[PDB]
Structures are given as C-alpha cells and as structure tokens.
Design an enzyme around this catalytic site. Structure first.
Site, PDB file in Angstrom:
ATOM      1  N   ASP A   6       0.914  -1.327  -0.024  1.00 23.92           N
ATOM      2  CA  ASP A   6       0.042   0.046   0.107  1.00 23.92           C
ATOM      3  C   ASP A   6       0.944   1.206  -0.082  1.00 23.92           C
ATOM      4  OD1 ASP A   6      -2.291   1.736   0.145  1.00 23.92           O
ATOM      5  OD2 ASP A   6      -2.404   1.241   2.266  1.00 23.92           O
ATOM      6  N   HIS A  45     -10.756  -2.266  -7.122  1.00 20.56           N
ATOM      7  CA  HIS A  45     -10.459  -1.160  -6.299  1.00 20.56           C
ATOM      8  C   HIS A  45      -9.692   0.075  -6.907  1.00 20.56           C
ATOM      9  CE1 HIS A  45      -9.935   1.302  -2.621  1.00 20.56           C
ATOM     10  NE2 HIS A  45      -8.837   0.985  -2.531  1.00 20.56           N
TER      11      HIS A  45
END
Ligand SMILES: *[C@@H]1O[C@H](CO)[C@@H](O[C@@H]2O[C@H](CO)[C@@H](O)[C@H](O)[C@H]2NC(C)=O)[C@H](O)[C@H]1NC(C)=O
Ligand SMILES: *[C@@H]1O[C@H](CO)[C@@H](O)[C@H](O)[C@H]1NC(C)=O
Ligand SMILES: *[C@@H]1O[C@H](CO)[C@@H](O)[C@H](O)[C@H]1NC(C)=O
Ligand SMILES: C[As](C)(=O)[O-]
Ligand SMILES: O=N[O-]
Length: 446
Positions: free
Chosen positions: A166, A302
């Site tokens: 991330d 996403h």
C-alpha cells in the site's frame, strides 16, 4: 509554488514513523487551550520541509487538525468553503449507504473538536508525548477517543491487513513532485486549500491547509481469505494460486504491488517493488477494446474504481491524466493485532483490525466523498462499458449492509456476477481541517 515550511507533513509526505496515535479531543476551555496551542503545539508541528529531510526527523512527529465544531469552539466562525466539512461525517453516512449503528459512538456526533496525530518509532515515545500534552493543557483539553496504529511487522511492512502493498499510488503535485511513470499530475489546489487553481474562496489563514477525511475501517481478514478460497475460479493452477488471483482482481494489484493490468495472470514481485514500473499503465492495451476488455483488470477492481485513468478518457499511453481534480493524498496506516491462529483457523474475526484511513484533499466533495459515493458505490461506473453493469468496488463498495454485486472478476466470463459480503466495515470517522502551521499559533490561538 508551495511553501512547504508551512504545510503539515502528513498531508504531502506522510509521518515516516513506525507508530501512530490518533488522539481525538474536545476543547473545554478555549482561552487556556489557545495559550498552549501557541506555546506548546505550534512550535513542534512537523512540516513537509522538516519530514522531507532525513537529517531533521523529529523524535515525535506531531500534526493537528480541527473539526468544524472545534473551530467554532475556538471562536473561528469563518466559512472554510466546504459544506461536507461543516456538516460533519456523521451526517454524510447516508451518502455512503452505511449505518451509524456500527460507528464508534464518539464519531457518531460532532462532539469531537480535533485530532492530534502523534507519530514515532516507538509507542513509549508517543505515550510520553501524550502525558506532556495532557500535563500542559490540563483540564482545557479532554480526550474523547483514540486509535493506535502501526506499520505491519517484518516483510509485511508497507502492506495493509489484507496483505497488499500500500502507498504506491499518489497524485504528483505539478511544480512540486517529479512525476513517476504513469503517475497523475495535478494542480496543488486539488490537495492544498488556497493553492494553485483551488477555485473555492478560503479564509486567508487557511491557505496552505487541507481537509483530512479520517475513517476507521475494520477489515475482516479471515473472512476475506475464506471467500477467496471458496470462490476461486476453476483452473489448472493450484487452489492457492487461483484464490490469490481472485484477491488480486478485486484489488487491481497483487500483494507485491504489481499491477494486474501489467501482469494479469500471476504476481511479479520484481515489478511490484519497482516504483519506475509499478504505476506505468493506463488500462489501455493494443489489440483490446477498452470498453469491453476485462482480461487484464476488472472494471470493478478497487484501484480502477478510485483512479479510472483511461476509463475517463485522455491518453491511452502513460501517463494518463484524467480526473485530476478527483485525486486524494492517502496517509492511512493499519491498526489492531495481526491475525491470530484461532481466527485464521475458524475463519472468524474476533479481534478488531483494519486501516486507519486518512485522505487529504482541498475539496471533500471532489475527493474521498466523491470516490466513495459516485464511483465505488455506483454499479454503472465506470461508464460506457460492456456489459454496462460494472457492479460495486469489492473492497470498499457499500450498499446498506447488503452483499455487494460485483461483475467482471472472473477472467473466463466478464458477465459472471459475484455476490460479496462486506470485508470492510466502517466504524465511521470525522472530517477535519489541517491548517497551515502559521495558523496554529496565529489565527487559531488568537
Ligand atoms: C512505461 O510504459 C511504456 C509503454 O506504455 C514504455 O514505453 C515503451 O517502451 C518500449 C520498450 O522500450 C518501447 O518499445 C515502446 O515503444 C514504448 N512505448 C511508448 C508508448 O513509449 C516505457 O518504457 C515504460 N517506462 C518504464 C520506466 O518502464
Ligand atoms: C475455514 O474455511 C476453509 C475454506 O472454506 C474450510 O476448509 C475450513 O474448514 C474452515 N474452518 C472452519 C473452522 O470452519
Ligand atoms: C456468463 O455469466 C452469465 C451471467 O451469469 C451467464 O448468463 C452466462 O451463461 C455465462 N457464460 C458462461 C459461458 O458461463
Ligand atoms: C500497454 As500494452 C504493451 O498491453 O498495449
Ligand atoms: O487506500 N487507502 O489507503
């Protein structure tokens, strides 16, 4: 051009620390609070300049942000130019099709006046800084709620609780960042209030600030992993490989960070680690119809839902520059314990863990709120696809507690629907304004 001496560090560069505490407070005595805000807090608020220099890292990095009601408590009645900020996040919950029944009680309201972000490489250093703050402010401050967060351990450092790398993708600020391959390039005023091409009038003291959207997002990791196993597409690959594939097609990246668009069938760890390559894509592919081809990446993934790239037009070769005004800077950090053996075995979460989600933007209506409501929660976004029904974002998409219908996930049949329980559960949050540092001991202490 940005004055990075005056911009709070977390907004543009992040805190750069192992541990973070989000300390949510109320102001009890404005006058006394202001005295100490100026004397104790202002001088130690970490700037972008400060955090960008390896030789000037503070022992504890401190940032501070105020809710609408917090500003009111300080006698600051100016219009910040953001309706959503003014109303507070609790009023915004309906927009995201979520119930406040799952919310932290302290969030479900407007009693919270602000948040102090403390960041350090140990929790001992954080705790002592809190003690110092509480000791100087005394009864003028009340702690209403707090959330501890940390980078994950060992080889999972930089990964969130589901296991995925991330903090790869952020907008580059024109004239500030030297852009990476594929990275979007935006006006500073998209992120910084009062900055270049921010069209909204702000109070002068708020120029250089940003709106901080905080979300406590619980992640149901064992349940996520079970779903992947149970719904893995048929194929000659191993069960784990095909489960992993489904996970990656939900996210839009493999756990290494490799974008599935560039490596659709397997993880590619060398690619995932390479900042010069891992964002160098637009979703376009020679020989393939952008409107119908989900073989590289589902329309519903996403990252495709939250940055559409070529899906909203513009260049088919990197870098795609579409929808720059809908960019957010992300400074989220995982919270809670690692998944325990009993939880992994039962497939059932008992210990709350997830992401302390932090998004910065100059307009909440264009950033986090827009991404959640208009894109992630919209079964016909992106537009102009075949089939037209993309379904919801499988990671953050919400439909009032109901399972999410998500299409395109299965490579062999883009029409195949999955009905997916929420793996992410909102426990709510608040909208804050992180002022420029000058305002902290300036207007806000006046
Ligand atoms: C980013 O991706 C582009 C392609 O989308 C790469 O540019 C190509 O590079 C190959 C190999 O050198 C050339 O044969 C193509 O002609 C290039 N295409 C275009 C449109 O430029 C580029 O190299 C990638 N960047 C990095 C750092 O890997
Ligand atoms: C957890 O899920 C897996 C895969 O669905 C299953 O094999 C296993 O039996 C489950 N564990 C329990 C305790 O039910
Ligand atoms: C693809 O999925 C759709 C929707 O469920 C279904 O109607 C169609 O028969 C499927 N095609 C194949 C080859 O499975
Ligand atoms: C980005 As391509 C080499 O699949 O056209
Ligand atoms: O995707 N938020 O870290």
């Amino acid at each position: 051009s940005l004055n990075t001496d005056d911009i709070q560090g977390d907004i543009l560069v992040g805190m750069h620390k192992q541990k973070q505490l989000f300390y949510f407070f109320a102001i009890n005595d404005p006058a006394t609070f202001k005295t100490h805000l100026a004397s104790d807090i202002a001088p130690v608020v970490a700037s972008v300049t400060q955090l960008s220099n390896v030789a000037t890292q503070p022992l504890v990095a401190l940032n501070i942000a105020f809710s609408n009601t917090g500003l009111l408590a300080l006698g600051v009645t100016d219009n910040l130019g953001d309706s959503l900020f003014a109303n507070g996040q609790a009023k915004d919950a309906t927009s995201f099709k979520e119930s406040t029944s799952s919310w932290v009680p302290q969030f479900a309201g407007t009693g919270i006046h602000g948040v102090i972000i403390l960041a350090s490489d140990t929790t001992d250093l954080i705790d002592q800084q809190v003690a110092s703050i509480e000791s100087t402010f005394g009864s003028s401050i009340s702690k209403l709620y707090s959330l501890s967060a940390s980078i994950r351990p060992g080889n999972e450092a930089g990964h969130e609780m589901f296991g995925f790398l991330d903090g790869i993708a952020q907008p580059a600020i024109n004239g500030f960042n030297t852009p990476l391959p594929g990275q979007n390039i935006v006006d500073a005023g998209v992120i910084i209030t009062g900055a270049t091409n921010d069209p909204i009038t702000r109070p002068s003291w708020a120029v250089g600030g940003s709106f901080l959207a905080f979300r406590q997002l619980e992640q149901l990791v064992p349940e996520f992993n079970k779903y992947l196993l149970d719904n893995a597409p048929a194929g000659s690959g191993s069960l784990q490989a095909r489960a992993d594939l489904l996970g990656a097609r939900m996210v839009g990246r493999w756990k290494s960070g490799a974008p599935i668009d560039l490596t659709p069938t397997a993880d590619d760890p060398a690619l995932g680690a390479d900042a010069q390559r891992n964002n160098n894509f637009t979703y376009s592919h020679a020989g393939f119809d952008l409107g119908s081809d989900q073989s590289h990446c589902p329309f519903s993934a996403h990252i495709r839902k939250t940055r559409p790239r070529a899906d909203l037009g513009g260049s088919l070769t990197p870098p795609n520059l579409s929808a720059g005004a809908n960019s957010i800077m992300r400074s989220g950090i995982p919270y809670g314990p690692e998944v325990t053996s009993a939880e992994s075995a039962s497939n059932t979460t008992t210990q709350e863990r997830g992401l302390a989600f932090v998004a910065y933007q100059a307009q909440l209506s264009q950033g986090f709120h827009f991404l959640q409501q208009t894109w992630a929660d919209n079964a016909n976004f992106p537009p102009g696809k075949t089939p037209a029904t993309v379904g919801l974002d499988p990671i953050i998409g919400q439909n009032n507690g109901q399972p999410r219908v998500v299409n395109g996930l299965l490579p062999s049949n883009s029409s195949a629907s999955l009905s997916i329980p929420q793996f992410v559960v909102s426990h709510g949050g608040e909208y804050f304004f992180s002022p420029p540092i000058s305002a902290i001991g300036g207007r806000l202490s006046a």
